[PDB]
């Protein structure tokens, strides 16, 4: 079970790593669309 | 010589049986150790569960922090754009 | 009949030394069982530990990346504000 809940943490961590880049680019994309 | 021989043999039997009692004591200590070794591994797994909890709690806070960051940048950007 | 007695004692000494041999073999089997059991559980646990510390170092870097992401977005609000 630990192998496993360590991989729910792991999966959610990686998705969050993604969301960070998604957000920053989403903002930069939108701001630069304003110029 | 049958007399000396009886005495030697009794000494040897005594030493053999003392030795057998000690080796049985040692077997008993090994059996108890198998138990203790099992308990120790368990305790290791509990430490691991503590680590996993701390990490879930941290992850959760970072998720909340991202959400809050997005929300307030959405309001910032709304007013910067209401101009 | 200390001659019959001698033969008896020789038999009893043979049975005691046989017993000792067997109990020693038993002890060795317990020591091997302990070793095998420890090797197995260590495998499992070293795996769980690897996964834990990976989680931990990652989440550490994600604390960093969150601050850093907020910084980047803020510089974007700075530029957007120059207008």
């Amino acid at each position: 079970q630990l192998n496993e809940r360590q991989e729910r943490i792991m999966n959610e961590a990686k998705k969050l790593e993604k969301d960070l880049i998604d957000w920053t680019d989403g903002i930069a994309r939108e701001v630069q669309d304003i110029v | 010589e049958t007399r000396d021989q009886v005495k030697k043999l009794q000494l040897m039997l005594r030493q053999a049986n003392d030795q057998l009692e000690k080796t049985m004591k040692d077997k008993q200590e090994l059996e108890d150790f198998i138990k203790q070794s099992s308990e120790d591994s368990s305790h290791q797994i509990s430490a691991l569960v503590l680590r996993a909890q701390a990490s879930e709690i941290l992850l959760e806070e970072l998720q909340q922090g991202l959400s809050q960051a997005k929300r307030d940048v959405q309001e910032q950007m709304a007013v910067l754009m209401q101009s």
Side-chain angles (χ1 to χ4, degrees), chain A, chain B:
Chain A
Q1 5 74 178
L2 269 162
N3 239 106
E4 272 32 288
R5 111 191 247 177
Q6 286 153 332
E7 84 144 295
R8 166 177 73 184
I9 285 165
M10 237 318 165
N11 289 325
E12 282 188 75
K14 247 65 179 69
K15 193 232 165 188
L16 180 60
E17 197 167 56
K18 131 191 254 61
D19 297 9
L20 255 18
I21 24 200
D22 281 2
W23 179 52
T24 46
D25 302 350
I27 295 303
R29 186 178 302 116
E30 281 165 36
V31 175
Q32 268 48 58
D33 290 359
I34 308 318
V35 195
Chain B
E1 205 272 330
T2 192
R3 255 205 63 93
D4 301 4
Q5 191 173 22
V6 172
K7 285 311 179 71
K8 182 204 60 201
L9 290 168
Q10 278 164 170
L11 207 202
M12 289 173 72
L13 217 195
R14 188 177 326 127
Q15 296 188 346
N17 288 316
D18 292 347
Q19 172 74 254
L20 192 67
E21 183 185 302
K22 178 261 201 286
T23 304
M24 269 179 295
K25 210 216 309 110
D26 296 354
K27 268 185 66 182
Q28 202 256 348
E29 296 174 347
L30 293 168
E31 292 156 9
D32 292 339
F33 188 85
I34 286 161
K35 185 179 166 52
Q36 162 190 135
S37 180
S38 189
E39 145 251 72
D40 125 85
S41 56
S42 188
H43 173 90
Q44 274 173 85
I45 285 172
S46 287
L48 280 166
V49 166
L50 283 166
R51 291 167 79 178
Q53 285 279 175
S55 292
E56 263 154 64
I57 289 157
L58 179 47
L59 180 54
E60 197 141 0
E61 285 167 333
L62 291 169
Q63 294 171 324
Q64 285 163 29
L66 183 54
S67 287
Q68 291 161 24
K70 285 164 168 207
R71 164 268 244 98
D72 66 68
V73 156
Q74 276 184 312
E75 302 160 2
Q76 219 179 353
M77 233 191 79
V79 5
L80 278 290
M81 288 312 181
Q82 82 163 254
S83 72

